[PDB]
């Protein structure tokens, strides 16, 4: 077995973990896109609300 094989298997474990971090970062940041969109769409809603109140 010569032990270096076990170190390479640990480098596979770390390799999988590294790409898994990027998958986890993606899965978390997907909801930031919705939270940022929810902030923007309210501005248009408020603008049209104020414009409608001005017409009234």
């Amino acid at each position: 077995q010569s032990q270096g094989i076990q170190q390479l298997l640990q480098a596979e474990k770390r390799a999988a973990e590294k790409v898994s971090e990027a998958r986890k970062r993606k899965n978390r940041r997907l909801k930031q896109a919705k939270e940022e969109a929810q902030a923007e769409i309210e501005q248009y809603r408020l603008q049209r609300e104020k414009e409608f109140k001005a017409k009234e």
């Binding site: 270096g4 999988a16 990027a22 940041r29 896109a33 049209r48």
Partner: protein, 49 residues
């Protein structure tokens, strides 16, 4: 012997690059996602008023 360090560093560097690609592709999708969401909701708000 020395070569096992290189053999690890090689697959580790492939993992570094693969993670960095997924990290890039994530931001690229979020710019498309906001583009789908914000314009559709703005148009629904405009159609309501």
């Amino acid at each position: 012997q020395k070569q096992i360090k290189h053999m690890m560093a090689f697959i580790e560097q492939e993992a570094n690059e693969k993670a960095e690609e997924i990290d890039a592709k994530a931001e690229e999708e979020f710019n498309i996602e906001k583009g789908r969401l914000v314009q559709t909701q703005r148009l629904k708000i405009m159609e309501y008023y």
